[PDB]
Write an enzyme that holds these catalytic residues in place. Structure first.
Site, PDB file in Angstrom:
ATOM      1  N   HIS A  69       0.899  -1.191   0.000  1.00 53.76           N
ATOM      2  CA  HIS A  69       0.000   0.000   0.000  1.00 53.76           C
ATOM      3  C   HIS A  69       0.925   1.226   0.000  1.00 53.76           C
ATOM      4  O   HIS A  69       1.622   1.562   0.969  1.00 53.76           O
ATOM      5  CB  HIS A  69      -0.831   0.069   1.303  1.00 53.76           C
ATOM      6  CG  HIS A  69      -1.888  -0.996   1.265  1.00 53.76           C
ATOM      7  ND1 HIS A  69      -2.189  -1.733   2.364  1.00 53.76           N
ATOM      8  CD2 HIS A  69      -2.643  -1.460   0.206  1.00 53.76           C
ATOM      9  CE1 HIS A  69      -3.111  -2.605   1.936  1.00 53.76           C
ATOM     10  NE2 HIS A  69      -3.428  -2.457   0.654  1.00 53.76           N
ATOM     11  N   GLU A  72       1.707   3.988   2.827  1.00 47.94           N
ATOM     12  CA  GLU A  72       2.259   3.537   4.115  1.00 47.94           C
ATOM     13  C   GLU A  72       3.780   3.640   4.170  1.00 47.94           C
ATOM     14  O   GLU A  72       4.496   2.675   4.336  1.00 47.94           O
ATOM     15  CB  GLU A  72       1.716   2.120   4.421  1.00 47.94           C
ATOM     16  CG  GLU A  72       0.141   2.128   4.372  1.00 47.94           C
ATOM     17  CD  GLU A  72      -0.557   0.766   4.353  1.00 47.94           C
ATOM     18  OE1 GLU A  72       0.192  -0.288   4.526  1.00 47.94           O
ATOM     19  OE2 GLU A  72      -1.718   0.609   4.111  1.00 47.94           O
ATOM     20  N   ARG A 127      -3.255   4.771  -2.301  1.00 52.67           N
ATOM     21  CA  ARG A 127      -2.797   3.499  -1.773  1.00 52.67           C
ATOM     22  C   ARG A 127      -2.785   2.378  -2.819  1.00 52.67           C
ATOM     23  O   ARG A 127      -2.130   1.349  -2.655  1.00 52.67           O
ATOM     24  CB  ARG A 127      -3.626   3.074  -0.571  1.00 52.67           C
ATOM     25  CG  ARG A 127      -5.024   2.813  -1.015  1.00 52.67           C
ATOM     26  CD  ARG A 127      -5.965   2.618   0.156  1.00 52.67           C
ATOM     27  NE  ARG A 127      -5.617   1.560   1.112  1.00 52.67           N
ATOM     28  CZ  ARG A 127      -6.064   0.306   1.031  1.00 52.67           C
ATOM     29  NH1 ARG A 127      -6.858  -0.090   0.048  1.00 52.67           N
ATOM     30  NH2 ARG A 127      -5.713  -0.583   1.959  1.00 52.67           N
ATOM     31  N   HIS A 196       2.451  -3.743   6.747  1.00 49.48           N
ATOM     32  CA  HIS A 196       1.599  -2.606   6.353  1.00 49.48           C
ATOM     33  C   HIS A 196       1.598  -1.597   7.503  1.00 49.48           C
ATOM     34  O   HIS A 196       2.283  -1.804   8.545  1.00 49.48           O
ATOM     35  CB  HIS A 196       0.104  -3.080   6.307  1.00 49.48           C
ATOM     36  CG  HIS A 196      -0.128  -4.254   5.435  1.00 49.48           C
ATOM     37  ND1 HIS A 196      -0.833  -5.362   5.831  1.00 49.48           N
ATOM     38  CD2 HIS A 196       0.411  -4.520   4.234  1.00 49.48           C
ATOM     39  CE1 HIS A 196      -0.784  -6.230   4.859  1.00 49.48           C
ATOM     40  NE2 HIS A 196      -0.039  -5.744   3.865  1.00 49.48           N
ATOM     41  N   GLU A 270       0.931  -4.679  11.116  1.00 51.06           N
ATOM     42  CA  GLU A 270       0.390  -3.322  10.831  1.00 51.06           C
ATOM     43  C   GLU A 270       1.177  -2.415  11.809  1.00 51.06           C
ATOM     44  O   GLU A 270       0.974  -2.446  13.038  1.00 51.06           O
ATOM     45  CB  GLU A 270      -1.146  -3.163  10.993  1.00 51.06           C
ATOM     46  CG  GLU A 270      -1.897  -4.349  10.384  1.00 51.06           C
ATOM     47  CD  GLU A 270      -2.061  -4.122   8.890  1.00 51.06           C
ATOM     48  OE1 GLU A 270      -2.174  -2.998   8.437  1.00 51.06           O
ATOM     49  OE2 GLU A 270      -2.061  -5.205   8.146  1.00 51.06           O
TER      50      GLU A 270
END
Length: 307
Positions: A69, A72, A127, A196, A270
């Site tokens: 993405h 990020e 993204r 991510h 994440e």
């Protein structure tokens, strides 16, 4: 810039800087690292993986991807720091040394190069990939919803203009299909990690179905331990669990695909933070973020070497 020792890890970089960094690293440690091109993005940019190895042929391997993405940024930044770290720690850190002496590590710093370029050129918060088509003026697919795992199920959007659009068909995006073919052709991956941001979660499969994986007890314990290691440095707290129970249903995800390929140790991280800055995390948080995630990842690699 001139040497990896001179590269500024505490700042965010553009695509060309990151690609130059890779060549430098290869130049300085030709015996440990190699750069492989496993494909070309939609707009024709090469897609590269760094291979870290002490030899052997087809040794069991660890896959790590960052930046699927584009917005990020903390992920690509952490990736470049990891690449340097592997070279520094080999031969100094008994644990990591034991890992490289028996397994290969494959690192994809910029999984979605076209969208990364776009985040610098036009919209910082883009993204998706940048593929286009016909029945829409909208561009791009959410690459983490394009895998062949519950593809098209609830937890993804069928509208091209959606930020979570899953695409025309499983593996329609060349950036995903390049990873799929490479991993299938290697056939000896034992771990698959996708990084991510943000939310501070360590997740395991699945996200597309409520069904429990059969390796649930072990994955959970490894997750727990990794989170404990990560927190150890700065006290950053992560939660952990299966994707669906933890977040929500999401289909076409990376790790659901990998796990269904037989790759047991499949986890998604994440990274920081929890919302204060979100995608726009301060550059002063790059190093600390990288250092603590490394402890998390090392923990999973150690278990992998051992099981």
């Amino acid at each position: 810039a001139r040497s990896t020792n001179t590269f500024n890890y505490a700042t965010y970089h553009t695509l060309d800087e990151i690609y130059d960094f890779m060549d430098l690293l290869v130049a300085e440690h030709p015996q440990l690292v190699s750069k492989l091109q496993i494909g070309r993005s939609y707009e024709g940019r090469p897609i590269y993986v760094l291979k870290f190895s002490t030899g052997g042929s087809n040794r069991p391997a660890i896959w790590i991807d960052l930046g699927i993405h584009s917005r990020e940024w903390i992920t690509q930044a952490t990736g470049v720091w990891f690449a340097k770290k592997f070279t520094e720690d080999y031969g100094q850190d008994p644990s990591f040394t034991a890992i490289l002496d028996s397994m290969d590590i494959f690192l994809e710093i910029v999984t979605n190069p076209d969208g990364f370029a776009f985040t610098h050129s036009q919209n910082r918060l883009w993204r998706k990939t940048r593929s286009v088509t016909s029945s829409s003026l909208c561009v791009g697919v959410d690459a983490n919803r394009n895998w062949d795992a519950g593809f098209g199920k609830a937890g993804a959007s069928s509208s091209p203009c959606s930020e979570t659009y899953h695409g025309k068909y499983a593996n329609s995006e060349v950036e995903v299909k390049s990873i799929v073919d490479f991993v299938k052709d290697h056939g000896n991956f034992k771990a698959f990690l996708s990084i991510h941001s943000y939310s501070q979660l360590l997740l395991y499969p699945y996200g597309y179905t409520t069904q429990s994986i059969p390796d649930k007890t072990e994955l959970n314990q490894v997750a727990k331990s990794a989170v404990a290691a990560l927190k150890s440095l700065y006290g950053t707290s992560y939660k952990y669990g299966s994707i669906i129970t933890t977040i929500y249903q999401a289909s076409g995800g990376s790790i659901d695909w990998s796990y269904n390929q037989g790759i047991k140790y499949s986890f998604t991280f994440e990274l920081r933070d929890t919302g204060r800055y979100g995608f726009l995390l301060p550059a002063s948080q790059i190093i600390p973020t990288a250092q603590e995630t490394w402890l998390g990842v090392l923990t999973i690699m150690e278990h992998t070497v051992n099981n």
